[PDB]
Structures are given as structure tokens and as C-alpha cells.
């Protein structure tokens, strides 16, 4: 009884709490004012993509954060929400990850096509078809996020399973299928797409150096660098997250001691913190490099006040 509790420093709890607060405010204000700011020849399309990205960021920040703070870090048990809360939460997370990844890859594609083939850069995707492609990204992401509605659930692990304080939002499915779905998310929402995006970034950079209306290159290069920053930040932030989930299953029960338990939890704090950092980092990467986005940002926040 009550063994389901987690040994975590109160100092660390308050730490990640404050951190999550900062990331929450910064990310929410950033992506929000970004979305209001978004409201053109080509940049309209990349504005739609950035719209999708900042939207996903807003989803994770607004919705996933307070759930994470309350139960995952502070409460531990019992799960206070409903099953729809759990399944919906994980589904939301995964869908957001897939959406983000697809947005990034598609952005790399459209950038490469923009710089290398300007003749086909106007005909390839009209804004209508672009929005259709965005909705396509959303729905596909949902389809890929579907397993979480089946994988995750609730189990009473109070030993007898009768004690109310033992209710836990946990994966109901077996260890094997768990390994399977974790692999699915790791490959499709991280490894493969970021690999493709990195490749397209390398090629874009090389052919950019090859290509070198002279002023236009100054803007497109800016685009490239921004993309690079986004990609590297993504991979570097999501890497321990996926490893943690791999760690979660690739370690046997006999190997699972209290040390690896608490360590897994501090690593959870760390990795998730890095995730929310990756969420809030986008508008900062936009403002810093673009300057114009920053001036109109300041203009709009001056409009609100």
C-alpha cells in the first residue's frame, strides 16, 4: 500500500514546476501572438506550415503541461482524471509529435523546391491545396496516434487492485506490443523524419553554396538557417524522451530497482522539460533571426497590452 509513491526531491519538484511555468508562459505567449501575427506570393504557404507548428506547440503547452505537472510530477497517484483524460492525453501528445515532424519534413521539401526550382515553386501547391495538405498532416497524425487510445489505460496496481489509491494511468497492453508501438513512434515520429529533414538541409545548404535579384538569397539563407536551428533543436530535445520510453520497456523487472526507479523519474523530469523547451523554442527562433517578425510581434503585443 502507498508503495506506488515516487521518491523525488521537493527541491527538484519546485524546480521543474517553476521551469514548466516559465516554458508555459513563454511558449503560450510566443506561439499565440505568432498565430495572431500570421493573419502573399510564397511566404503564405510557409506561414500555413508555421501555423500548424505553432498550433501543435500551443496544444502541447496549453493542454499537456498542467496534466504533467499535477499528476506526473506532483501527485503520482491516484489518477484523478478519467480514462478519456489519459488516452486523450497520450493521443494528443503523439498526434502533436507526428504533426510537428511532418510539418518539418514538408518544410524542408518546400524549401529545397523553392531554392532549386523556382519555376515549379509557384505551381506545386496553391494555398487551398496547401491547407488541404495541412489538414492531411493533421488527420494522418491522428491515424498514427490511434494506438495510444488502445495502448494506454487505467490499472489499479495497489497489489490487490481494490484500493482506490492504486488507480494508475498506465499502458494496459503487454510488454511485447508495448515495445512494438514505442518502436513505431520512435521510428516514425523521430528517427526517419528528422533523418530526411537533415538530409534535405544538407542538400539545401550545399546547393545554396552552389547557387551563390541578388538580395533574395539573403532572405532564403535566413530561412535555411532557421530551419537548421529548428531541426537540431528538435532532435536534441526529443532524443532522451524516446530513449526514456525505450528505457521504460527494455529493462527487465529483476533489473528494475529503486535506484533505477528514481533515476527513471528524474530522467522523466529532465526529458519532459526538454520536450516543453522544444515546444517553446520555436517563436524565439523566429523572432531572433527574422527581425521583422520581431517588430510586428512587438507591434501586436503593443496592440493587446
Amino acid at each position: 500500500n502507498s508503495d506506488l509513491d515516487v521518491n523525488t526531491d521537493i527541491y527538484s519538484k519546485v524546480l521543474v514546476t517553476a521551469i514548466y511555468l516559465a516554458l508555459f508562459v513563454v511558449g503560450t505567449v510566443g506561439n499565440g501572438v505568432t498565430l495572431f501575427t500570421l493573419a502573399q506570393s510564397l511566404q503564405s504557404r510557409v506561414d500555413y506550415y508555421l501555423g500548424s507548428l505553432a498550433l501543435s506547440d500551443l496544444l502541447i503547452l496549453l493542454f499537456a503541461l498542467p496534466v504533467d505537472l499535477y499528476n506526473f510530477i506532483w501527485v503520482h497517484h491516484p489518477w484523478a482524471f478519467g480514462d478519456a483524460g489519459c488516452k486523450g492525453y497520450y493521443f494528443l501528445r503523439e498526434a502533436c509529435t507526428y504533426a510537428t515532424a511532418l510539418n518539418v519534413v514538408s518544410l524542408s521539401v518546400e524549401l529545397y523546391l523553392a531554392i532549386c526550382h523556382p519555376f515549379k515553386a509557384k505551381t506545386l501547391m496553391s494555398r487551398s491545396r496547401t491547407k488541404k495538405f495541412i489538414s492531411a498532416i493533421w488527420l494522418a497524425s491522428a491515424l498514427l496516434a490511434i494506438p495510444m487510445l488502445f495502448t494506454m489505460g487505467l490499472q489499479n496496481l495497489s497489489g490487490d487492485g481494490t484500493h482506490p489509491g492504486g488507480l494508475v494511468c498506465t499502458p494496459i497492453v503487454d510488454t511485447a506490443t508495448l515495445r512494438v508501438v514505442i518502436q513505431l513512434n520512435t521510428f516514425m515520429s523521430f528517427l526517419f523524419p528528422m533523418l530526411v529533414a537533415s538530409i534535405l538541409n544538407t542538400v539545401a545548404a550545399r546547393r545554396l553554396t552552389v547557387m551563390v535579384e541578388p538580395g533574395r538569397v539573403q532572405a532564403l539563407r535566413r530561412g535555411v538557417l532557421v530551419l537548421r536551428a529548428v531541426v537540431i533543436a528538435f532532435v536534441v530535445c526529443w532524443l532522451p524522451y524516446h530513449v526514456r520510453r525505450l528505457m521504460f520497456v527494455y529493462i527487465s523487472d529483476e533489473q528494475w530497482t529503486t535506484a533505477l526507479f528514481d533515476f527513471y523519474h528524474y530522467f522523466y523530469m529532465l526529458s519532459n522539460a526538454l520536450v516543453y523547451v522544444s515546444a517553446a523554442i520555436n517563436p524565439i527562433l523566429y523572432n531572433l533571426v527574422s527581425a521583422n517578425f520581431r517588430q510586428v510581434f512587438l507591434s501586436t503585443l503593443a496592440c493587446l497590452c
Binding site: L4, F72, V168, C169, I251, D253, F261, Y264
Partner: peptide, 5 residues
């Protein structure tokens, strides 16, 4: 003792 989160 396997974690549940």
C-alpha cells in the same frame, strides 16, 4: 519494481 509512468 517497474515504473508505471
Amino acid at each position: 519494481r517497474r515504473p508505471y509512468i
